[PDB]
Design a protein around this ligand. Structure first.
Ligand SMILES: Nc1ncnc2c1ncn2[C@@H]1O[C@H](COP(=O)(O)OP(=O)(O)NP(=O)(O)O)[C@@H](O)[C@H]1O
Length: 261
């Protein structure tokens, strides 16, 4: 059991688009003195269920109803954002992060959760430097999102499935290996057209294997896109870009992250 009184505010961590986020101590048993991230909600940004157990998805520990509000207690993730940490660099360092991402993402998909706008701020590191996906339940509206990371079917307000998120996954991958985004204009609107129309040019400094994976991920038609079938990331995991990845050691957090916080 829990209520707001069970938790003492230490500091506000941020006040983003998808809510206000406090660091808290639990003072109640059994997890006395354990730090969490609290997030106060309810009373643009709607919600959907969450009880997710995955090494690369944020755990909801508690969630309770008090004064016509909804509090959510979650892993306190000390590592910060993935992108921040890189901005302080190998293809082998990225492949670790993309392997872990793929496993968690694929887990959200099997539960029916789909990001649409999956962006770098949704991917936090923990103390050890393993990734944790956040902010997957939500849903801004008046659907709004960050256009750079959106698949074509999504930009076009057509239907979408989990394939949308492997497009985004390619964008993240591309952004990591290059420091640039694959489609960007001066405007949200010019960016949208490049996503629909521009045939992406492969940077010729990427491995032949990374370019293989990016061409596979960047299919305007979801049905041609890698991961698009119902076994999802089974297709992706088998790609030669991840030859060096023992997917079972990875899930068990037995592979040393390349950067230590
Ligand atoms: N479990 C956690 N959940 C959310 N944020 C956390 C957590 N642990 C630490 N943080 C920190 O708190 C910040 C609050 O982010 P938040 O307001 O939830 O993001 P957002 O709305 O997804 N971002 P944006 O892209 O700007 O719309 C994070 O970026 C981290 O600095």
């Amino acid at each position: 059991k829990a209520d707001p009184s069970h938790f003492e505010l230490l500091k506000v961590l941020g006040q983003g688009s998808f809510g206000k986020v406090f660091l808290v101590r639990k003072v109640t048993r059994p997890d006395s003195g354990h730090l969490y991230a609290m997030k106060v909600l309810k009373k643009m940004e709607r919600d959907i269920l969450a009880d997710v157990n995955h090494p690369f998805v944020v755990k909801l520990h508690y969630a309770f109803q008090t004064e016509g509000k909804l509090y959510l207690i979650l892993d306190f993730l000390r590592g910060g954002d993935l992108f921040t940490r890189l901005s302080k660099f190998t293809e082998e360092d990225v492949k670790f992060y993309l392997a872990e991402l793929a496993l968690g993402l694929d887990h959200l998909h099997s539960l029916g959760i789909i990001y649409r706008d999956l962006k770098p701020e949704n991917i936090l590191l923990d103390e050890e430097g393993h990734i944790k996906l956040t902010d997957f339940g939500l849903s801004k509206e008046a659907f709004c999102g960050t256009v750079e990371y959106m698949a074509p079917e999504v930009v076009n307000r057509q239907g979408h499935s989990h394939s949308a998120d492997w497009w985004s996954y390619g964008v993240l991958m591309f952004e990591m290996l290059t420091g640039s985004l694959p489609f960007q204009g001066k405007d949200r609107k010019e960016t949208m057209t490049l996503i629909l129309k521009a045939k992406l040019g492969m940077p010729q400094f990427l491995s032949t294997e990374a370019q293989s994976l990016l061409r596979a991920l960047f299919k305007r038609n979801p049905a041609n896109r890698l991961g698009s079938g119902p076994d999802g990331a089974e297709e992706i995991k088998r790609h030669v870009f991840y030859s060096t990845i023992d997917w079972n050691k990875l899930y068990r957090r037995e592979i040393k992250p390349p950067f230590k916080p």
